[PDB]
Every structure is written in structure tokens, then in C-alpha cells.
Amino acid sequence: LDRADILYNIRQTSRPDVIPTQRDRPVAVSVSLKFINILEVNEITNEVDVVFWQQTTWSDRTLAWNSSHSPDQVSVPISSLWVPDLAAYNAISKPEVLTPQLARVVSDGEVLYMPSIRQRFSCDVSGVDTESGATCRIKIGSWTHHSREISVDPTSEYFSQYSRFEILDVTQKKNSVTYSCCPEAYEDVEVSLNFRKK
Amino acid sequence: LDRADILYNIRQTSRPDVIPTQRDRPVAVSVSLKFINILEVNEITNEVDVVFWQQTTWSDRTLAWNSSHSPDQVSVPISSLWVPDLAAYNAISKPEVLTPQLARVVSDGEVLYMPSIRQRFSCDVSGVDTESGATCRIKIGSWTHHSREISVDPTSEYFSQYSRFEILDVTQKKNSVTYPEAYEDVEVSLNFRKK
Amino acid sequence: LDRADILYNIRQTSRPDVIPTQRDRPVAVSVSLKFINILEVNEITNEVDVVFWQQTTWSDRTLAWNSSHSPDQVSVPISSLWVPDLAAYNAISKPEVLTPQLARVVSDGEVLYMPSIRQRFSCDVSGVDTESGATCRIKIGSWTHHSREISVDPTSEYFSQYSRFEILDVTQKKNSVTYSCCPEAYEDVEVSLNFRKK
Amino acid sequence: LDRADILYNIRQTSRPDVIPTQRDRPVAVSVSLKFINILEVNEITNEVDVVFWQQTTWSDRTLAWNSSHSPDQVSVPISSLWVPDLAAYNAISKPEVLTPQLARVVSDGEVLYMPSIRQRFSCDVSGVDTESGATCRIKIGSWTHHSREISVDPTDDSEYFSQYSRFEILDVTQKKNSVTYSCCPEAYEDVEVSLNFRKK
Amino acid sequence: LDRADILYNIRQTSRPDVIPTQRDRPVAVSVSLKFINILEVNEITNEVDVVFWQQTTWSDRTLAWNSSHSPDQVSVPISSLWVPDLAAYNAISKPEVLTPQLARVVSDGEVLYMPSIRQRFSCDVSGVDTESGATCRIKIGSWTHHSREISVDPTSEYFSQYSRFEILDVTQKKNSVTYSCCPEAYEDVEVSLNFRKK
Ligand SMILES: N#Cc1cccc(-c2nc(-c3cccnc3)no2)c1
Ligand SMILES: *[C@@H]1O[C@H](CO)[C@@H](O)[C@H](O)[C@H]1NC(C)=O
């Protein structure tokens, strides 16, 4: 097997529309935001403009191959893969993807998709000039899949030294809520960005 | 039947261009706006910038399958489905869809499409600082189908605590307008004010 | 015949690239602008931002069908139809189409396409505060077809109550223009928008 | 032959990726800008916002047909034609095409493509309020083809210019440059368009 | 062989999704930025708006042909070629490509892709009024390929005389970075732009 063969098969056989549920268990999706820049902040309107790398990760065994005398990994266009329908609940602009839309696929079916995204959010900007800082919370989950089809889970350093802002702390936490309407839990990852102006 | 089969069949058979009229009766489409944010308001120009979840609902039985030992629901790209040509009559910008363009399809043919949309409207903004508040009305209906092909019908809580504004009341009511055929719309009245 | 069959045939046998000239006569295209909103006006730069419904209407016999026990009309994506290459000569932005790109087709081949468009124009804005008002002229014609392939012809009420402006008068008249580069003539419809600030 | 047949054949065969070199001669491409509007000008940043009709003409005999009892011309979507990869060297925004993307094709293979474009440029804006006016130069050439594959050539100045612009045109001149660099042994042609304009 | 044949074969065969690794050696990609304009600068937010020609060079032996009595080169749409997934690490806007998306392909398989790009970056703008000038660093590397799949390597004159700024110096150097999350090196080219206001 060479790269050409692996990518040929992936393209011919993968079903982007089909969630790779294994066994009627949820697909375990891991999400982790690496903040790169805070670009525009408005304490009056409570709106932030952020650049982050959305480290996403999951498994699709229909992509697997025997890497015996073969590449262990390939880069694959995401249009040829199933991808989690993740959305930020408090986003107020379309996610503007800044990077090549490729995912990294390992021979066992592990997939890493880490786009660089610029997006605006509605969050708490109060205290951004305070030393103690503002804390902006961003919630990311599947837009249409519930906890038994997709589970989301969590997993400062790549942040721009030239930003007008700096990061005090970032915490990532998972919410699971059960409602009266529905028998299923809804999962999201809440990312708390503690930042202030320099 | 597994998900792969269901999505394979939906894709191979579904005619997105073809309104799922059952019987020469209208397709019953339900619309309900869940406001999430009021972002920019202008009392001079009478223009608002709004973020809402457009809960849209209908039946397309050509999508149905026997869910005996099968999933009861799947997520389907809307490009593979027929979708109501709904438009906001008083919108003044393109609807900017913020979410994955998927719809949720139940084995009986029930379809739920609930995109998150950011859009600008021309409406009455007067009184927004008044604590009686402004009342902005948004009308949504089919752009090309009349009441016998498509009927629209109606059906605060998910609104952002961090908005500069707050919601006093939201009412949804249905109009039918004849200019030889009736065109229905849903009128959504958004009563809001600045904090 | 049901809707599915009609749309199937239209899709399989329409020729979006082919002007439905019948007979070596021009295709009679009717244009009529229904103004909905005047959004941004600048008397210094002489630029207006307008929202209108472009009631475009014309015939194409090759779409026709026998509506005996069949629907008399269907909604058809414009990508599956021939559409007049109409342009606004004094437009200074791309036409931003706000509505579903569908046209209404009658069984005799009559086609109605009425998109809602937001567009900026270069026109006379002088007198917009005067109560006599400004008069902005917009010219619409085929971009590449001359008067023997396409003829354009003409045909306040839907205008927004909440606009900063109001409409005094709208008149639509037809010109037949020859330019210097070219031997042939290009018809246009001139739309005069008399409006003022409230 | 009717329009349907001509457009059918053009589409089934025209090869948009393939420069219609005849004979190992360059394709003769004519360029001519007809200014329609000057929209925003900034003498500090030296940037202009311009609307122009880019009159573009060339031959492609693989499009030709015998117009005996047939239409002499047809309108053809440019996606079905080869089109010169012209770029403005000093452009600082994407060309925003305002018009239907059709070209006019004559039965002998002559092609006329004349889009209306709004674009921003980096040029000399100094003197725009002076009555002598500013002179903004715009250079247009093939982005990847050299002078032996593509040759560019020039063809009333205010004639289609907007009477409602804040600006007016004193003069427009079009001249042709040919440039050979030290990297590559090959000449690259451009058309330099000088726009002499001032505020009213 | 004529151009039509060469382009026909290139399009029928070449695989844009498949990195032209030859031997299990990295594809040697050369990057070199030719700055054309510095358009908008903000010493407060540390953000610059730049126009540059990204001279990108590499070899794809899959594209080769025998140029005996044939053209030595052709222009090919990049949608029909494999292209390095290069990204600017400190970019804060999408790359806006200003030129026709073609690459130049030589009969030996050498490929030159040199788009003109407008992009916004987060970099050090301090000292831009100082005569010593500011020094903005831009890092470009493969987004998903490591040093054994893709190596990047380096290689003022085309800069606009009408810019509000001028260039003191441009230096290009190569970094190789190995993280604690993956056993593998990721190369980038660091471009240092020394510029000041006139
Ligand atoms: N038959 C038909 C047909 C075809 C295309 C477009 C339209 C059209 N309907 C409306 C409209 C406005 C307000 C309320 N309801 C409908 N505006 O345009 C109608
Ligand atoms: C290339 O083609 C020809 C004949 O078609 C022959 O002259 C030449 O030696 C060939 N060379 C290659 C490297 O095969």
C-alpha cells in the first residue's frame, strides 16, 4: 500500500454523511481550543473576536488499513471524511476557517482535524481591564446528534505575544444536562477563557 | 437497516427539487423562531441585527423507512432533502447560517431543520429605550409556493444573558393573504428593550 | 403528469445556456422593480443602497407541458432554467440575492423570476432632503444580448413603512441604446426613483 | 445549425484549460479598460476604488463554425471557454465581477469578454485635488503565460464614465510594456493604463 | 505532444490529494515571499495588512513528459495538481488570493505556484515610526505534513513605490520544531520584514 492507494480507497468508500458509530455506542469526539489571538473586544456589547485552533479528534474504523509496509498516516480532505457537526452555541458569526481543510488520518482510524478559526462570540467581557480579568465562556457541542450518537470531551502556549491581551487561565469542562422533554443527555464542552488587557 | 443504508437510500432517491405534496394537500410546515441574541439596533434607521434558531418542521414521507431493528433517526445534509423555500419578507441582508447544514429525519418521515441564523431586518425599533419596549415584527413565508402547496403555522428561553437587550414578549401568529391564490406567512412579534 | 415528472423532464431537457428564441424573434423579457427599502444614502458620494424585488418575467416554450390532469405550475431552481443576463448598468456592488433562487413556471412556458435584491447604485442623490426629493435612475438591460435576441420592457406599494425615506414617484421607461464600439443596439429599462427623507 | 447545436458542441469540446495557441504563436489578447466610476480615493494611503469594463478580445479557432444558415454569434458562459489569466499587478483587492459571466463568441472564433469589475488599486493619488489631477497607473498582464504564449495589446475616455461621480477624467492613455527578468529567459507583456483624474 | 494532450493527461491522471513523495523522502518545497505592499498597520493592536507574492516551488515527477517536440512548460489550474498545505501560523485572516489560480509546470515535473495574496497578520509593529523600523515576523509551514513528508526551505524589489511604508530589510530563515505530543519535526520558514513609515 502507498499513499495513492490509501487515499483512493478512502475516497471511494468513506461515507461523509454517515456517523461512524461503532456498536451503537456514541462516537467519542475530543475537543480542545488552543487560543492564538484575541483580536477585538467590546465591554459594552459583550462581544469578542477570537482566533483559535480547534483540536478535534475521533475514530472512524472504516478508514483503517494495514500499515505493515505502508504509511502510518495520510492527510485527507475533510470533504472525503465524516466530521462531527460541532457548533459554538454562543457564536455570532460564521466560523472563518483560516487553514487548509485537511484532516490527519492514522492507519487505525484515528482522525485529527485541527482548523484555525476566527469567530465572534457573545460572552462576558466585564472586567477585561481589571487585573482579575474577564472570563469569556464558549460552549461547543454537536448541533444535531445527542449523547448516544456523539459524546464530547475535553483533553495559552501558542498565544500571540503581540496581542493587546494576555491569558490568565483556560479551563475546559464538560456539561451533561438531562431535560424533561427528552430522555437523552445533551453534551457540550464549556471553555472558560480568563483574559485581560495588558 | 443501519445508518449507512438509510443515508444511502435517502441520497439515491430523494428529490430535493420536489415538494413532498401528499395528495394535493399542502405540506404542513411549522415555523418557530427562538431568539438567541439582539446584536445591533438602530432607532433612527429602524434596523435590527438578530440571531435566532429557526425551528422548521414538516413531514416528507418519501424519506420514511421501517425502523424495526434500525435507527429511529438520522442526521441528513439538507442538500439531499427537499426544504421549504422560506423567506423573511422584511429581511435586508442574506440569512447568514451559523451552524452545520444538517436536518434531523425520523423514520416516519418527520423532518426537523433548525439552523442558527444571523440576519438584519427592517422593523419598528421605536421605543427600544422606553421600558414598554420596541416591537419588531418579522414575517416568514414560502417565497414561491401558495397555501395549497405549503401551509405555514406557528408552534425567550435560549436568549443570551449577555445581550444589551432583553425580551419582554414574543408572540407568533399566522396570516393568509390573497392578492387567485392565498399566500400564508407567520408573523413573529418581538417585544424587546434595552437593559 | 405529477410535479415529480414535470421537474424531472425540465431538468433532463432544459438548456440553461440556450436563449429560448422562438423564430429568430427576440425573447420578450419584462422587468419591473418593486422597491422595498432605501437603506443607505450619501448625497456627497451620490450612492444609494436599495432593496427591491426584481419582477422578471418571460416565455420559454420548451418548458411547456400538457396540464390536462396535471399541476398548472411548478417552482423550479433557476440553475435548471435559461435566465436573462440582466445587469444594472450603474450598479457598484454585486447584486446580493436575499431569497430562494427559484422561478415559477407555468405549463404554457411562462416563467416568473422575482428575487429580492440588495444592491448599491451610482445615481443622483441631490435633493434628498428637499421635499421635492431626489430622483435616482437605474438602468437594467441584457449584458450580452442585443435587441433582436432580447427585448426588455416595463410592466411603492410593498415599500417599508419603517424606512427613513419615502417614495414620491416611480416611473419606468424603455430606451434603445447603441454604443460606439458596436453596430448593434441594446435595449434597457430606465427606472426613475423619486424619493426623499421623511 | 441553431444556437442549441452550437452551444452543445462548444460545451462538449472547447477545453477551458487549453490556451488556443495557433501554430506556436502567442494568442493575441487585446485589453482595454473603459472607466465607469471612481468611488473612493485616499491620497494618504494612495489607494483607489474603481469600477471599469474590461474589454477583452482574442481568437480561438476551435470555437469556430460554418455560419451559412446559422447564427453569426452566441453568448457562452466563460466556464466553457478558455480565458486569458489576466491580472492587475497593483491590485489590492479581489476583482469583484458585477455582471453575468458570459462571453460573446463569433462564428470565426473571435471572442469578446467584457466584465464590469470593481477593484481596489495601489497607485499614485497625489494631486487629485490639484486641477492638474492625479495619475493612477494600472498594469494588466498574463499571470503565468509569457510573451510567446500570450501577447497583450491596447486597442472617448469619459465616454461611459458616470456623470454622478465625485471625480472626472482628464485623460486615459494605454501603452504596452514588455519585461524580461533575470531569473527566466522570457518576456512578460503587460498593458499599462494611465488614468488622469481629479475631484470636481 | 501538444498543450492539449499534456493538459489532458495531467488532468486525467494526476492526483491532487496525493503528496508526490518520491522514495519516502520529503517533498522539497521552496517558499519565498516577495512583498508588494504594506497596506494597513496598527501599532496598538500589533496587526498588519500585507500584499505579497508567495513564490512556491517543488517537484512532482508524476507530471513529467518527454518534451522532445513538445512544449517545455504549461499553465495548469491548481485544482488539477497536488499543492503544499502551507499556512501562515500567525495569520488572522483568510488568505485572499488576488490572481488566477494557475501553476506553471515544467516537463521535468518542476512546479511553480506564485499567487498574489492579501492577508492580515499578528506581529510586532512596535517601532514602525522609529527610523530603525518595525520587524514583523511571518512563519509559513505545512499545516498537516511533518518534515519527512514535506520540507520547507527559503530561496524588496517588487515593492510598491506608492506605499506609505518602505522596506529596510527582509530575511528568510528556516526553523525545525519537535513537540512533546508527537515524535516528529515540523519545519517552517520564518520571514522577517523590517519596515518603517516614510
Ligand atoms: N406565483 C408566484 C410567485 C413567484 C415568484 C415570487 C413570488 C412572490 N411572492 C412574493 C410575496 C410577497 C409577500 C407575501 N407573499 C408573497 N413576492 O414574490 C410569487
Ligand atoms: C522522447 O520521445 C522520442 C520519440 O517520440 C525520442 O526521440 C526521445 O528519445 C524520447 N525520449 C524519452 C526520455 O524517452
Side-chain angles (χ1 to χ4, degrees):
Chain A
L1 270 200
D2 57 22
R3 286 171 177 93
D5 296 324
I6 295 161
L7 286 148
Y8 179 80
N9 298 345
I10 282 180
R11 191 193 167 119
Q12 293 293 82
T13 61
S14 162
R15 303 240 301 151
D17 51 332
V18 178
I19 183 173
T21 18
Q22 199 169 340
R23 163 71 110 225
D24 297 314
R25 339 189 191 231
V27 179
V29 179
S30 306
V31 203
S32 166
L33 306 197
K34 316 289 191 205
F35 292 92
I36 311 299
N37 220 318
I38 291 140
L39 288 184
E40 179 155 357
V41 153
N42 189 312
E43 193 166 6
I44 294 182
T45 69
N46 261 331
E47 297 176 11
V48 306
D49 202 311
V50 174
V51 174
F52 57 95
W53 298 349
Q54 184 187 292
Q55 188 186 307
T56 320
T57 268
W58 70 98
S59 171
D60 191 339
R61 275 231 112 224
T62 69
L63 300 173
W65 69 91
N66 184 341
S67 86
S68 76
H69 302 67
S70 308
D72 202 34
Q73 305 186 1
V74 289
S75 293
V76 183
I78 61 178
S79 65
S80 297
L81 301 181
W82 176 88
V83 160
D85 59 334
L86 298 187
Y89 298 158
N90 58 308
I92 57 172
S93 81
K94 270 175 132 132
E96 169 177 30
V97 179
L98 308 181
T99 42
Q101 299 271 52
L102 305 174
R104 191 76 179 175
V105 178
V106 193
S107 63
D108 58 4
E110 280 291 322
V111 185
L112 165 68
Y113 175 49
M114 178 157 18
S116 176
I117 295 177
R118 189 185 167 148
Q119 203 165 11
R120 298 264 352 227
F121 301 90
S122 161
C123 61
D124 193 16
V125 189
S126 76
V128 61
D129 277 307
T130 307
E131 320 280 26
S132 151
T135 291
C136 171
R137 298 170 303 113
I138 297 170
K139 280 185 183 207
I140 300 188
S142 164
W143 189 248
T144 66
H145 295 280
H146 54 70
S147 59
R148 293 181 316 132
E149 293 174 340
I150 289 182
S151 72
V152 303
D153 300 284
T155 304
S156 65
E157 169 191 354
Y158 305 114
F159 192 76
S160 181
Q161 71 185 290
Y162 303 116
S163 176
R164 292 187 41 206
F165 308 81
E166 57 185 347
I167 302 182
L168 311 174
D169 193 32
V170 181
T171 46
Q172 324 216 357
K173 145 215 233 223
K174 165 180 188 165
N175 306 320
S176 330
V177 176
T178 355
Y179 297 100
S180 46
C181 76
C182 335
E184 296 91 358
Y186 282 152
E187 310 193 357
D188 63 78
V189 170
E190 194 176 333
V191 173
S192 299
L193 176 65
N194 197 353
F195 74 106
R196 61 158 181 237
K197 187 192 311 180
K198 285 164 153 173
Chain B
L1 271 201
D2 55 19
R3 284 171 179 92
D5 294 324
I6 296 165
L7 285 149
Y8 176 82
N9 295 346
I10 284 178
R11 190 174 171 163
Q12 295 291 84
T13 47
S14 174
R15 294 269 307 284
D17 51 330
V18 179
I19 183 173
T21 356
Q22 210 175 327
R23 278 205 190 293
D24 296 319
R25 350 174 179 255
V27 178
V29 177
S30 307
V31 200
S32 169
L33 306 197
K34 314 291 191 203
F35 293 90
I36 312 299
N37 221 318
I38 291 141
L39 290 185
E40 179 155 356
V41 153
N42 189 311
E43 193 167 5
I44 295 184
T45 69
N46 261 333
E47 296 173 12
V48 306
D49 206 309
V50 176
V51 174
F52 57 96
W53 298 350
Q54 185 186 294
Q55 188 187 305
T56 321
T57 273
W58 71 97
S59 163
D60 187 344
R61 200 129 207 194
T62 67
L63 300 172
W65 69 92
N66 182 342
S67 86
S68 75
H69 300 67
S70 311
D72 196 45
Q73 305 184 1
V74 290
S75 292
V76 184
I78 59 175
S79 66
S80 295
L81 300 180
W82 175 89
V83 161
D85 58 331
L86 296 186
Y89 298 161
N90 58 308
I92 55 171
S93 79
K94 263 170 143 149
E96 169 185 13
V97 178
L98 307 179
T99 43
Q101 297 271 54
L102 305 175
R104 190 77 178 173
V105 179
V106 194
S107 66
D108 57 3
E110 281 291 322
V111 184
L112 165 69
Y113 176 49
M114 179 154 24
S116 174
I117 295 178
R118 191 185 165 147
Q119 200 169 12
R120 274 209 107 194
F121 300 89
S122 159
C123 60
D124 194 11
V125 187
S126 76
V128 60
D129 275 306
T130 305
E131 77 175 28
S132 168
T135 292
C136 174
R137 309 170 295 114
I138 298 172
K139 279 184 184 206
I140 299 186
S142 162
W143 188 249
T144 71
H145 295 280
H146 55 69
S147 59
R148 283 179 330 141
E149 292 174 341
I150 290 179
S151 72
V152 302
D153 299 282
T155 304
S156 58
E157 160 184 13
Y158 305 114
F159 193 76
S160 181
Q161 72 186 291
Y162 303 116
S163 178
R164 280 180 64 187
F165 307 80
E166 57 185 346
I167 303 182
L168 311 176
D169 193 32
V170 180
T171 44
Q172 322 217 356
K173 78 160 169 176
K174 166 179 185 166
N175 308 318
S176 186
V177 190
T178 322
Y179 314 8
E181 299 244 349
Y183 294 82
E184 308 185 354
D185 64 77
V186 168
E187 195 175 334
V188 173
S189 300
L190 177 67
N191 197 351
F192 72 107
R193 63 155 180 239
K194 167 144 95 54
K195 285 164 153 175
Chain C
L1 272 199
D2 56 19
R3 283 172 181 92
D5 295 324
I6 294 162
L7 284 152
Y8 178 80
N9 296 348
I10 284 174
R11 192 193 166 118
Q12 293 291 80
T13 62
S14 211
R15 313 259 325 242
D17 52 331
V18 178
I19 183 171
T21 20
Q22 58 187 15
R23 224 179 193 97
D24 289 332
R25 318 141 146 355
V27 178
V29 179
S30 310
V31 202
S32 168
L33 306 197
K34 315 290 190 203
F35 293 93
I36 311 300
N37 220 315
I38 291 140
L39 287 185
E40 194 163 340
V41 153
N42 188 312
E43 193 167 6
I44 294 183
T45 69
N46 262 330
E47 296 175 15
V48 305
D49 204 309
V50 175
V51 174
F52 56 98
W53 299 349
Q54 187 185 290
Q55 189 187 307
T56 317
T57 213
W58 71 89
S59 161
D60 182 342
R61 254 191 334 108
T62 79
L63 298 171
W65 69 91
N66 184 342
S67 88
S68 84
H69 303 65
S70 310
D72 196 45
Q73 304 183 3
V74 291
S75 293
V76 183
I78 59 176
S79 66
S80 296
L81 303 180
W82 176 89
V83 160
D85 60 333
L86 297 187
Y89 299 160
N90 59 308
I92 56 170
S93 79
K94 275 174 135 145
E96 190 185 347
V97 179
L98 308 178
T99 42
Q101 298 271 53
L102 306 175
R104 191 75 182 176
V105 176
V106 195
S107 65
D108 57 2
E110 279 290 322
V111 184
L112 165 69
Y113 175 49
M114 180 156 19
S116 177
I117 294 175
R118 190 187 166 147
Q119 201 166 13
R120 296 275 334 249
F121 299 90
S122 159
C123 62
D124 192 13
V125 189
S126 77
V128 60
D129 276 305
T130 306
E131 137 182 31
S132 178
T135 291
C136 172
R137 299 171 304 112
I138 297 170
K139 278 187 182 206
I140 298 187
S142 166
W143 188 247
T144 69
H145 295 278
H146 53 68
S147 60
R148 293 182 317 131
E149 292 173 345
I150 287 181
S151 72
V152 304
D153 302 281
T155 306
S156 53
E157 174 191 349
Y158 290 120
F159 192 76
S160 181
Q161 168 185 151
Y162 303 115
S163 178
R164 280 180 63 188
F165 308 81
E166 57 185 346
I167 303 181
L168 312 175
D169 194 31
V170 179
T171 44
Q172 321 218 355
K173 79 159 171 176
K174 166 178 186 166
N175 311 318
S176 204
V177 179
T178 284
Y179 310 91
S180 49
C181 51
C182 334
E184 220 82 62
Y186 302 75
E187 307 188 354
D188 65 77
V189 169
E190 194 178 332
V191 173
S192 299
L193 175 67
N194 197 351
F195 73 106
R196 62 155 179 239
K197 196 194 303 179
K198 284 164 152 174
Chain D
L1 269 201
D2 57 19
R3 283 171 180 92
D5 294 323
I6 294 163
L7 285 149
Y8 179 81
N9 297 347
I10 282 174
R11 187 190 172 126
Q12 296 290 83
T13 72
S14 64
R15 312 234 52 218
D17 51 330
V18 178
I19 181 172
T21 32
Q22 223 178 318
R23 166 53 67 65
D24 285 325
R25 307 131 102 61
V27 179
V29 178
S30 306
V31 202
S32 168
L33 306 196
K34 310 310 196 168
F35 292 91
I36 312 300
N37 219 319
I38 290 140
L39 290 184
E40 171 143 40
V41 153
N42 188 312
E43 191 167 7
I44 294 181
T45 69
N46 263 331
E47 298 175 14
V48 306
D49 204 307
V50 175
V51 173
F52 58 97
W53 297 351
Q54 185 185 292
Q55 179 178 334
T56 314
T57 269
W58 66 90
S59 197
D60 187 342
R61 296 286 292 177
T62 77
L63 298 172
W65 69 90
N66 184 321
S67 88
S68 74
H69 308 64
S70 309
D72 197 46
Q73 306 183 2
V74 290
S75 291
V76 182
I78 59 176
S79 67
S80 299
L81 302 180
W82 177 88
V83 162
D85 58 331
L86 298 185
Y89 298 162
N90 56 307
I92 56 171
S93 77
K94 269 175 133 127
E96 192 186 345
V97 180
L98 308 178
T99 43
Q101 299 269 51
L102 306 173
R104 191 74 181 176
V105 178
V106 195
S107 68
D108 60 358
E110 281 290 319
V111 185
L112 312 102
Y113 176 51
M114 195 181 328
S116 175
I117 293 176
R118 189 185 167 150
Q119 200 167 14
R120 273 210 109 191
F121 300 89
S122 157
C123 59
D124 193 16
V125 188
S126 80
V128 61
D129 276 302
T130 304
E131 178 180 37
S132 187
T135 290
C136 172
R137 299 170 303 112
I138 297 174
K139 280 185 180 207
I140 298 187
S142 166
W143 188 248
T144 71
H145 295 280
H146 55 69
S147 60
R148 292 183 315 131
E149 293 175 341
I150 289 181
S151 74
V152 301
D153 300 284
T155 301
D156 184 285
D157 293 349
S158 274
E159 168 184 357
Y160 307 113
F161 193 76
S162 179
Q163 73 185 290
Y164 303 116
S165 177
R166 280 179 64 188
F167 307 81
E168 56 185 346
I169 303 179
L170 311 176
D171 195 31
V172 179
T173 47
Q174 322 218 355
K175 76 160 172 174
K176 164 179 190 166
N177 310 315
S178 182
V179 191
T180 323
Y181 323 186
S182 62
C183 94
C184 14
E186 295 253 346
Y188 295 84
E189 306 190 354
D190 64 75
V191 169
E192 193 177 332
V193 174
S194 300
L195 175 66
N196 197 351
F197 73 106
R198 59 154 182 241
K199 179 180 339 172
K200 285 164 148 176
Chain E
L1 269 202
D2 56 20
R3 286 171 178 91
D5 295 323
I6 296 165
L7 283 150
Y8 177 82
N9 294 345
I10 284 178
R11 175 203 188 102
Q12 294 291 81
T13 48
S14 72
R15 309 226 27 225
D17 51 332
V18 176
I19 182 172
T21 29
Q22 182 174 4
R23 278 287 151 83
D24 283 339
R25 294 140 126 48
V27 177
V29 177
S30 305
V31 203
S32 168
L33 306 198
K34 315 289 189 205
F35 293 92
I36 312 300
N37 220 318
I38 290 139
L39 290 183
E40 179 163 358
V41 152
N42 189 311
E43 192 167 6
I44 295 182
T45 69
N46 264 331
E47 298 176 13
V48 304
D49 204 309
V50 175
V51 173
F52 57 97
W53 298 349
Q54 185 186 292
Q55 188 187 307
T56 317
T57 292
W58 74 93
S59 180
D60 186 340
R61 264 277 167 171
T62 270
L63 299 170
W65 67 92
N66 169 358
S67 88
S68 78
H69 341 354
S70 310
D72 197 45
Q73 305 184 0
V74 289
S75 291
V76 184
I78 61 175
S79 65
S80 297
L81 302 178
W82 175 88
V83 159
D85 60 332
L86 298 185
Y89 298 158
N90 56 308
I92 58 173
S93 76
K94 268 175 135 129
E96 189 192 342
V97 179
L98 307 178
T99 43
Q101 298 270 51
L102 307 173
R104 190 72 181 176
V105 178
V106 196
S107 64
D108 60 2
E110 280 291 321
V111 184
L112 155 72
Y113 177 49
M114 178 158 19
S116 176
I117 293 174
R118 192 186 166 145
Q119 217 175 319
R120 243 197 147 193
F121 301 89
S122 162
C123 58
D124 194 12
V125 187
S126 80
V128 60
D129 269 339
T130 307
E131 171 180 42
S132 180
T135 292
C136 175
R137 299 170 305 112
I138 296 171
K139 279 184 181 208
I140 299 185
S142 167
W143 189 247
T144 70
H145 293 279
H146 53 70
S147 58
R148 292 181 316 130
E149 291 175 343
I150 290 181
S151 72
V152 302
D153 300 283
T155 304
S156 59
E157 169 188 355
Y158 305 115
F159 192 76
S160 181
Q161 73 186 291
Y162 303 116
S163 177
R164 281 179 64 187
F165 307 80
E166 57 186 347
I167 302 181
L168 312 177
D169 193 33
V170 179
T171 45
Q172 322 217 357
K173 78 158 170 176
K174 163 181 188 165
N175 309 317
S176 184
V177 186
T178 324
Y179 296 54
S180 276
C181 90
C182 340
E184 289 209 13
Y186 295 81
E187 310 187 352
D188 65 76
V189 169
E190 193 177 332
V191 174
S192 299
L193 177 65
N194 198 351
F195 74 107
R196 62 158 180 238
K197 195 195 303 175
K198 285 164 150 176

